[PDB]
């Protein structure tokens, strides 16, 4: 793939000193560039090997006309010890247009919902997607609601098949997926069960509490955070609404472990730090990305450990407890370069620690773990 002449000489220096500050990198380029990537919570393990078999979930986005798929790809990530690999796709499912976004539902992760063309958002049953289907691979539903495309998209952790989009039309969705009626050979047609018009401009994410059923946050590029409560009547304005940053805010994240930590990330460069029991006193924030900040997930298993990605090719690995403070950010954990493009998604894999698989917009897959010298300093 065209790299620029900088770009080719920053990532060969970046490849010489892989060697010091990772414990892994795998890399791979896909046929297509894709912009969303989640690894599914199964591990298979094959007894007497020195590795595992998990997946991730991967888009395409096609220059046009090109059909566009929802991907399962999956990966052999090796064991990590304690004193080349393949990645193959497994299944391919014809999807409308690009795959804007896509997340399995935490319940039953056989169904996968997407974001897709012109605001339509697509449910997949996996297992109604196999080598016996007898005709065209159709979505198992399709949710009409939005006038847009758009980008968020959560499935409600506490309540199975309650799903949450947002889209560049200024609304969030709310959808009850009922799956047991899905089968291959027809596409169910649902309508939201409720829609907020809360927003002023494009909503670019959408969370719901992992510990709490009714509680869904929001930010959009009117530089809001909003915290919806969706058992109350949904022309009713939500009972908060920030003024977080003063630029676009991309992307937000919920603490899984601390129920009152979030995260927002922005246009402004910036990560903040926000306590939900008094959502309007910003607690921190975190600087280091040197562009727009647009994506925000925390560690599935290290409560103070956070990760953000950026137009600026890097994902950021934050340390919490590093705040209370000899020249540079102290918090800011690790960063990474590998990628040559800006970076469309990321994810941390939830079966080993401290490994992240991220996407950029050239192509490229990358699995990568950074240096346990780095990470665990403090260990004995």
Same mark, same amino acid.
């Given at each position: 793939?065209?790299?620029?002449?900088?770009?080719?000489?920053?990532?060969?220096? !970046?490849?010489?000193?892989?060697?010091?500050?990772?414990?892994?990198?795998?890399?791979?380029?896909?046929?297509?560039?894709?912009? *969303?990537?989640?690894?599914?919570?199964?591990?298979? /393990?094959?007894?007497?090997?020195?590795?595992?078999?998990? =997946?991730?979930? @991967?888009? *395409?986005?096609?220059?046009?006309?090109? &059909?566009?798929?929802?991907?399962?790809?999956?990966?052999?990530?090796?064991?990590?010890?304690?004193?080349?690999?393949?990645?193959?796709? #497994?299944?391919?499912?014809?999807?409308?247009?690009?795959?804007? +976004?896509? =997340?399995?539902?935490?319940?039953?992760?056989?169904?996968?919902?997407?974001?897709?063309?012109?605001?339509?958002?697509?449910?997949?049953?996996?297992?109604?997607?196999? %080598?016996?289907?007898?005709?065209?691979?159709?979505?198992?539903?399709?949710?009409?609601?939005?006038?847009?495309?758009?980008?968020?998209?959560? !499935?409600?952790?506490?309540?199975?098949?309650?799903?949450? /989009?947002?889209?560049?039309?200024?609304?969030?969705?709310?959808?009850?997926?009922?799956?047991?009626?899905?089968?291959?050979?027809?596409?169910?047609?649902?309508?939201?069960?409720?829609?907020?018009?809360?927003?002023?401009?494009?909503?670019?994410?959408? &969370?719901?509490?992992?510990?709490?059923?009714?509680? @869904?946050?929001?930010?959009?590029?009117?530089? *809001?955070?909003?915290?919806?409560?969706? =058992?109350?009547?949904?022309?009713?304005? %939500?009972?908060?609404?920030? &003024?977080?940053? #003063?630029?676009?805010?991309?992307?937000?994240?919920?603490?899984?472990?601390?129920?009152?930590?979030?995260?927002?990330? $922005?246009?402004?460069?910036?990560?903040?730090?926000?306590?939900? +029991?008094?959502?309007?006193?910003?607690?921190?924030?975190?600087?280091?990305?040197?562009?727009?900040?647009?994506?925000?997930?925390?560690?599935?298993?290290?409560?103070?450990?956070?990760? $953000?990605? $950026?137009?600026?090719?890097?994902?950021?690995?934050?340390?919490?407890?590093?705040?209370?403070?000899?020249?540079?950010?102290?918090?800011?954990?690790?960063?990474?370069?590998?990628? *040559?493009? =800006?970076?469309?998604?990321? $994810? !941390?894999?939830?079966?080993? +620690?401290?490994?992240?698989?991220? @996407?950029?917009?050239?192509?490229?897959?990358?699995?990568?773990?950074?240096? +346990?010298?780095?990470?665990?300093?403090?260990?004995?």
């Amino acid at each position: 793939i065209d790299l620029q002449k900088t770009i080719q000489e920053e990532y060969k220096l !970046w490849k010489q000193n892989v060697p010091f500050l990772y414990d892994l990198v795998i890399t791979h380029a896909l046929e297509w560039p894709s912009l *969303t990537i989640q690894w599914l919570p199964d591990k298979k /393990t094959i007894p007497g090997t020195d590795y595992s078999i998990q =997946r991730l979930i @991967l888009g *395409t986005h096609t220059s046009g006309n090109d &059909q566009n798929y929802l991907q399962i790809a999956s990966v052999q990530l090796p064991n990590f010890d304690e004193d080349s690999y393949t990645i193959e796709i #497994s299944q391919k499912i014809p999807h409308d247009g690009d795959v804007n +976004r896509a =997340r399995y539902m935490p319940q039953k992760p056989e169904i996968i919902a997407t974001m897709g063309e012109g605001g339509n958002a697509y449910i997949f049953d996996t297992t109604c997607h196999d %080598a016996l289907t007898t005709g065209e691979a159709l979505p198992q539903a399709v949710l009409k609601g939005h006038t847009a495309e758009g980008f968020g998209l959560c !499935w409600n952790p506490n309540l199975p098949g309650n799903l949450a /989009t947002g889209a560049e039309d200024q609304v969030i969705c709310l959808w009850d997926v009922q799956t047991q009626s899905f089968t291959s050979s027809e596409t169910k047609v649902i309508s939201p069960i409720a829609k907020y018009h809360r927003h002023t401009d494009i909503v670019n994410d959408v &969370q719901f509490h992992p510990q709490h059923e009714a509680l @869904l946050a929001s930010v959009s590029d009117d530089c *809001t955070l909003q915290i919806h409560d969706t =058992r109350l009547n949904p022309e009713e304005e %939500a009972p908060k609404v920030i &003024q977080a940053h #003063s630029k676009a805010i991309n992307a937000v994240a919920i603490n899984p472990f601390n129920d009152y930590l979030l995260a927002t990330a $922005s246009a402004d460069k910036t990560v903040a730090l926000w306590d939900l +029991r008094n959502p309007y006193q910003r607690l921190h924030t975190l600087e280091g990305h040197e562009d727009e900040v647009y994506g925000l997930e925390w560690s599935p298993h290290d409560e103070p450990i956070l990760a $953000s990605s $950026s137009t600026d090719r890097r994902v950021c690995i934050w340390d919490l407890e590093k705040i209370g403070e000899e020249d540079g950010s102290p918090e800011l954990l690790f960063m990474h370069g590998g990628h *040559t493009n =800006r970076i469309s998604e990321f $994810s !941390w894999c939830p079966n080993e +620690r401290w490994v992240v698989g991220s @996407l950029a917009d050239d192509n490229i897959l990358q699995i990568w773990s950074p240096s +346990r010298v780095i990470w665990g300093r403090d260990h004995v």
